[PDB]
Structure of murine T cell receptor (tcr) valpha domain:
Amino acid sequence: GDQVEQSPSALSLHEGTDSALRCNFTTTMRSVQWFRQNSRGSLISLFYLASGTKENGRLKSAFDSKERRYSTLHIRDAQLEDSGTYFCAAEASSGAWQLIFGSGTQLTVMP
Amino acid sequence: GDQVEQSPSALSLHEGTDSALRCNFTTTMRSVQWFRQNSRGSLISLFYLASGTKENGRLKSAFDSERARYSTLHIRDAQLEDSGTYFCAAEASSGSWQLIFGSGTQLTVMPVT
Ligand SMILES: [Cl-]
Ligand SMILES: [Cl-]
């Protein structure tokens, strides 16, 4: 019973390559949030988008779909230290504190 | 009723009082993690529990129970700084990666006097 489907579940990239993670929603969502788990297990927010696109460093996220049925997180020039677990979460309401999470993506970057 | 449901959805309590949050699983879980979301939106880990209990300051988490049916996060002597959205996540499937999250509990601590 997924309302938020994340893909891929796992992926291996060679250092320097670009790839994208996707967050699919069974219904239009108000906003999406992308996180990277740190060493302690905390989910550190990378982006929060209600629409449009955002960028920071080698990362870029988009939620510019008309229906907004999905969102993408693009990782460019992948580095060994980018390896880790990534999560996306969606907010149904325009100001709700409740989030619906994806199952996570294991990224492995190889030398 | 998915696999992980938190209760209550929200609560307000007076500074200095105690209360508890619950993370209910529709099945046995290997471990549980509790988080408090910061102002940026990040879910900051408070406890990681595979079993037993853990205490850190005014916070105390317990996974001891019906053999992994639910976990609790107890907040004693609540302080205004405790206000925020709390989340719990459990591992049932694979290892570490791939967690199942609760929907979140909004805690509001009110000043006394
Ligand atoms: Cl942290
Ligand atoms: Cl942060």
Summary: Chain B has no helices and eleven strands. Chain B touches chain A at residues 2, 9-10, 33, 35, 37, 40-45, 48, 85, 87, 96-101, 103-104, 106 (CB under 8 Å).
